[PDB]
Ligand SMILES: *[C@@H]1O[C@H](CO)[C@@H](O[C@@H]2O[C@H](CO)[C@@H](O[C@@H]3O[C@H](CO[C@H]4O[C@H](CO[C@H]5O[C@H](CO)[C@@H](O)[C@H](O)[C@@H]5O)[C@@H](O)[C@H](O[C@H]5O[C@H](CO)[C@@H](O)[C@H](O)[C@@H]5O)[C@@H]4O)[C@@H](O)[C@H](O[C@H]4O[C@H](CO)[C@@H](O)[C@H](O)[C@@H]4O[C@H]4O[C@H](CO)[C@@H](O)[C@H](O)[C@@H]4O)[C@@H]3O)[C@H](O)[C@H]2NC(C)=O)[C@H](O)[C@H]1NC(C)=O
Ligand SMILES: *[C@@H]1O[C@H](CO)[C@@H](O[C@@H]2O[C@H](CO)[C@@H](O[C@@H]3O[C@H](CO[C@H]4O[C@H](CO)[C@@H](O)[C@H](O)[C@@H]4O)[C@@H](O)[C@H](O[C@H]4O[C@H](CO)[C@@H](O)[C@H](O)[C@@H]4O[C@H]4O[C@H](CO)[C@@H](O)[C@H](O)[C@@H]4O)[C@@H]3O)[C@H](O)[C@H]2NC(C)=O)[C@H](O)[C@H]1NC(C)=O
């Protein structure tokens with residue numbers, strides 16, 4: 001089973017004795033999530049960056065007070081598209097042989113770096129896949145984050161900044177990336193993630209939604225908590241995401257083979273249709289990766305698909321791409 | 326000090342031996358909030374409907390698993406504008422001399438029923454104040470809620486139903502209430518509130534976002550928990566509000582002297598500017614109720630303003646009406 005919520009979810013020192021930062025050994029895997037990167041680099045996750053969904057959920061909860069439903073939702077979503085369902089292993093970065101024997105195509109078990117499954121365009125501190133590297137910290141983008149913190153956050157990162165910067169990264173991609181895609185699951189995650197630094201990288205004794213540019217660079221670039229960093233004083237994730245959505249209302253869509261041809265996708269879900277997004281993710285995205293699984297793979301798919309459904313906070317009705325039972 | 330978060334926030338029986346439903350005595354106070362109403366009728370709050378901030382915050386958390394920031398934000402906003410800052414008492418309903426000696430005008434201490442401070446138009450199950458009773462359960466509107474739950478919820482109330490019903494109640498008021506006002510604070514809370522029934526009134530052992538009509542009537546009409554009701558399995562309030570907002574985009578505004586004259590207000594806060602909403606609440610709303618507090622009043626104001634600010638989940642810069 002996925003973990004339950006924390007028993008004691010108060011703020012506490014998480015940059016402590018048993019969870020020191022350490023530099024990367026060769027073979028250590030890091031990817032497009034500064035959240036999971038930091039947990040790994042503090043040993044809340046295995047330090048090589050290869051983990052079970054359960055390990056990942058306990059980590060985000062213990063290390064950072066990510067809420068339970070959000071942790072279940074994101075973990076099992078990633079695992080379903082990016083992880084190996086038999087070994088129950090997911091890489092938080094590049095495709096690796098340490099996740100075990102692969103399933104048939106088109107499932108690719110590419111880990112969190114796999115473009116177009118979880119990872120997607122218009123990341124705040126990462127370049128679009130189309131340009132070549134979709135997971136490494138990018139200094140130009142980060143210093144754009146700083147600018148926007150200066151203009152909009154009086155020098156801090158907060159949900160007002162998130163609003164502006166989220167729109168700016170969208171415009172950037174429309175303008176430069178002929179393969180820009182911003183529909184369905186990526187349309188969804190791209191908004192919440194911009195709340196995460198304000199809600200979770202801010203020291204929990206303060207919990208005031210103003211993230212400083214030191215704490216920011218530390219998380220985004222080095223996967224390192226600040227000294228004496230306390231986690232937030234309660235479980236949360238994308239609280240305030242409506243601030244980011246309403247700052248510059250966008251319709252989901254994509255460039256159509258060239259820059260500046262952003263075209264609305266009338267079949268995409270959006271924020272008014274979360275159950276449609278859940279249903280698409282299950283009955284199209286996951287299903288296309290595993291169209292005709294063997295008996296063993298089917299039972300693993302169904303188990304993980306169960307756990308995924310549990311993390312859908314809107315409720316919705318479970319769908320069953322391989323039948324009930 | 327405001328209570329902090331529950332120590333143990335898991336689901337548990339809350340309709341219990343310690344907390345039985347009991348019919349109203351005469352002079353028992355109930356108001357426009359089904360949540361506070363139900364806690365008072367179960368003895369989580371004082372049964373007569375008059376309570377401290379600290380009592381209200383413990384109630385909503387213990388009885389229903391309202392989250393600690395949302396409890397502080399809502400509780401100290403209400404008290405600031407509707408409660409007695411000297412006696413530390415707020416009526417969850419009508420103005421009552423039971424909150425103690427009134428401060429001077431233009432402060433009203435009208436309790437939760439006070440139109441235009443916290444209470445406002447386009448409620449799900451309460452009529453707009455213009456029509457003359459802004460607090461009693463209204464059966465025709467609940468019937469619309471039942472209908473919309475059949476149409477969009479498969480028989481149940483859920484976030485998709487909340488999205489359609491919130492827009493329809495807006496349209497209703499624009500079409501019928503020449504005094505419709507839907508800006509600033511009321512614009513913000515009217516959305517979050519339509520998530521509550523699906524997030525909070527749903528038995529905690531399911532937590533599946535689908536509220537049945539038996540349980541909805543219970544809460545909204547009789548301020549009664551279902552038999553064997555468990556509270557939610559974690560602390561929450563307005564999870565999913567973005568769904569309700571995007572279902573039918575609306576700007577803040579009001580009718581101007583007549584029906585079908587909805588006039589957007591570009592000076593209002595909206596969901597993109599929660600710090601401006603906080604600001605305007607403190608600097609215009611509270612300030613105008615207490616333009617010149619005596620030294621004692623001013624002390625109590627600042628103390629409660631501090632607490633209100635703690636509850637502002639977006640963060641924001643604290644603002645100071647009295648320095
Ligand atoms: C939320 O609301 C609060 C109000 O509830 C906002 O705070 C208020 O901000 C306004 C506008 O900025 C300030 O107005 C300015 O006040 C100064 C003088 O202020 C001094 O005197 C005030 C009066 O004293 C009271 O009590 C005495 C008796 O003891 C009475 O006689 C008085 O009449 C008053 O009742 C006093 O209140 C002030 O104390 C407060 O502020 C100080 C900080 O300065 C704190 O230490 C205190 O603790 C307390 O908070 C203070 O001692 C005026 O001189 C200003 O006039 C200038 O600007 C005008 C336009 O705004 C212009 O018309 C004038 O001609 C003059 O313009 C000139 O000066 C400007 C620079 O000041 C130049 O920029 C300009 O070009 C030109 O050169 C001005 O009216 C209030 O003081 C302040 N009130 C409080 C209680 O703090 C708050 O800003 C709001 N928050 C947000 C985010 O909006
Ligand atoms: C429980 O809650 C409900 C809803 O809030 C409430 O019923 C509502 O009562 C109000 C107040 O009377 C009604 O408002 C009127 O609506 C009609 C429109 O007819 C509608 O019919 C259906 C509903 O059956 C609507 O859904 C549909 O959209 C139709 O439009 C308007 O014509 C009325 O306008 C008159 O009164 C206004 C307010 O005073 C004036 O501003 C306006 O100019 C009109 O005034 C004219 O008549 C006046 C006398 O009435 C007089 O001054 C002049 O002659 C003047 O020219 C009005 O806005 C609303 O429709 C009701 N909704 C329902 C029944 O679904 C219940 O009463 C409430 N229960 C309680 C409080 O106990």
Ligand SMILES: *[C@@H]1O[C@H](CO)[C@@H](O[C@@H]2O[C@H](CO)[C@@H](O[C@@H]3O[C@H](CO[C@H]4O[C@H](CO[C@H]5O[C@H](CO)[C@@H](O)[C@H](O)[C@@H]5O)[C@@H](O)[C@H](O)[C@@H]4O)[C@@H](O)[C@H](O)[C@@H]3O)[C@H](O)[C@H]2NC(C)=O)[C@H](O)[C@H]1NC(C)=O
Nearest residue numbers: 275276279314315316317476477478479483484485486534
């Ligand atoms: C709140 O609760 C409601 C209801 O449970 C949820 O609403 C559902 O929303 C989903 C979006 O994810 C809708 O799914 C979409 O359905 C499309 C088809 O629409 C029409 O056909 C449907 C098929 O009905 C079948 O089954 C019924 C009986 O079971 C038979 O009558 C029919 O013959 C069919 O066999 C109808 O149900 C529907 O009314 C339409 O006419 C489909 O093409 C899309 O791909 C997608 O799957 C679904 O339609 C909604 N169901 C209802 C009853 O409204 C909502 O998500 C919940 N919200 C939350 C937040 O929990």
Ligand code: HEM
Nearest residue numbers: 032033035060071074078118119120123124125193196200
């Ligand atoms: C629960 C397991 C989680 C998974 C599986 C996950 C996965 C991911 C993935 C795949 C991305 C890349 C999306 C893109 O293209 O930008 C991402 C981005 C992001 N993640 Fe996570 N994440 C998880 C938890 C967290 C946590 C706990 C945090 C911080 C508290 C976090 C913070 C962020 C941020 C801020 C980004 C955007 C990075 C940027 O745009 O520069 N994530 N995450």
Ligand code: HEM
Nearest residue numbers: 357358360385391396399403444445448449450451521525
């Ligand atoms: C924290 C203290 C609280 C205060 C001070 C408060 C206050 C109020 C007030 C004044 C209103 C009337 C607004 C209007 O509709 O005109 C309201 C409405 C409402 N409240 Fe609360 N409330 C609190 C907690 C809760 C809780 C814990 C719940 C649990 C679900 C809740 C559920 C609701 C709902 C569903 C409405 C909408 C009623 C309708 O539209 O018919 N409230 N509340």
Ligand SMILES: *[C@@H]1O[C@H](CO)[C@@H](O[C@@H]2O[C@H](CO)[C@@H](O[C@@H]3O[C@H](CO)[C@@H](O)[C@H](O)[C@@H]3O)[C@H](O)[C@H]2NC(C)=O)[C@H](O)[C@H]1NC(C)=O
Nearest residue numbers: 125126127128131132133136137138139140141142172176
């Ligand atoms: C980190 O992300 C930034 C943001 O995009 C990347 O900077 C961009 O780098 C590209 C090529 O390296 C620059 O493109 C060049 O621009 C000229 C026109 O000015 C064009 O004619 C050339 O053909 C070429 O495409 C682009 O200007 C530049 N953008 C900004 C805002 O600096 C950077 O490459 C990323 N770092 C990586 C991928 O390591």
Ligand SMILES: *[C@@H]1O[C@H](CO)[C@@H](O[C@@H]2O[C@H](CO)[C@@H](O)[C@H](O)[C@H]2NC(C)=O)[C@H](O)[C@H]1NC(C)=O
Nearest residue numbers: 007008009010011012013014230233331332333
């Ligand atoms: C829940 O955890 C919190 C934070 O860790 C506890 O409060 C602290 O407990 C630690 C013990 O490791 C003490 O060193 C601190 O002095 C406490 N901080 C305070 C009181 O601000 C709290 O005791 C825990 N609650 C329960 C019921 O175990």
Ligand SMILES: *[C@@H]1O[C@H](CO)[C@@H](O[C@@H]2O[C@H](CO)[C@@H](O)[C@H](O)[C@H]2NC(C)=O)[C@H](O)[C@H]1NC(C)=O
Nearest residue numbers: 279282283284287317318319320321322323324
């Ligand atoms: C999600 O996908 C599954 C599999 O495609 C759908 O189940 C199929 O539905 C068709 C049409 O009713 C049946 O003829 C097949 O036998 C079903 N295959 C099964 C059950 O393995 C399922 O209905 C989809 N769910 C939704 C809500 O669209």
Ligand SMILES: *[C@@H]1O[C@H](CO)[C@@H](O[C@@H]2O[C@H](CO)[C@@H](O)[C@H](O)[C@H]2NC(C)=O)[C@H](O)[C@H]1NC(C)=O
Nearest residue numbers: 004005006007008332333334335336337338558
């Ligand atoms: C937290 O609350 C519950 C009581 O509501 C405690 O355990 C629950 O209640 C009984 C007691 O064992 C169990 O049968 C239930 O399964 C428990 N509910 C759960 C686990 O959701 C629990 O022990 C309390 N405190 C701690 C620290 O767990």
Ligand SMILES: *[C@@H]1O[C@H](CO)[C@@H](O[C@@H]2O[C@H](CO)[C@@H](O)[C@H](O)[C@H]2NC(C)=O)[C@H](O)[C@H]1NC(C)=O
Nearest residue numbers: 440453454455456457502503504505581582583
């Ligand atoms: C609709 O709004 C108007 C105007 O805001 C209210 O008019 C008030 O009337 C009362 C007494 O009848 C006076 O105390 C106020 O001075 C008036 N205000 C203004 C600005 O003119 C009106 O009463 C509201 N209608 C109802 C039925 O509540």
Ligand SMILES: *[C@@H]1O[C@H](CO)[C@@H](O[C@@H]2O[C@H](CO)[C@@H](O)[C@H](O)[C@H]2NC(C)=O)[C@H](O)[C@H]1NC(C)=O
Nearest residue numbers: 151152153154158159160209600601639640641
């Ligand atoms: C982010 O921080 C900024 C600056 O501290 C806050 O923005 C200020 O908000 C006030 C009133 O809301 C306005 O003067 C400007 O919009 C801002 N000032 C400046 C200098 O930009 C903002 O409220 C913060 N947002 C959150 C959610 O904390």
Ligand SMILES: *[C@@H]1O[C@H](CO)[C@@H](O)[C@H](O)[C@H]1NC(C)=O
Nearest residue numbers: 129130131132178179180257
């Ligand atoms: C982008 O899509 C185009 C057209 O579909 C195709 O050439 C290629 O697969 C993609 N290009 C890159 C650089 O990924």
Ligand SMILES: [Mg+2]
Nearest residue numbers: 119120121123
């Ligand atoms: Mg990306």
Ligand SMILES: [Mg+2]
Nearest residue numbers: 445446448451
């Ligand atoms: Mg009302």
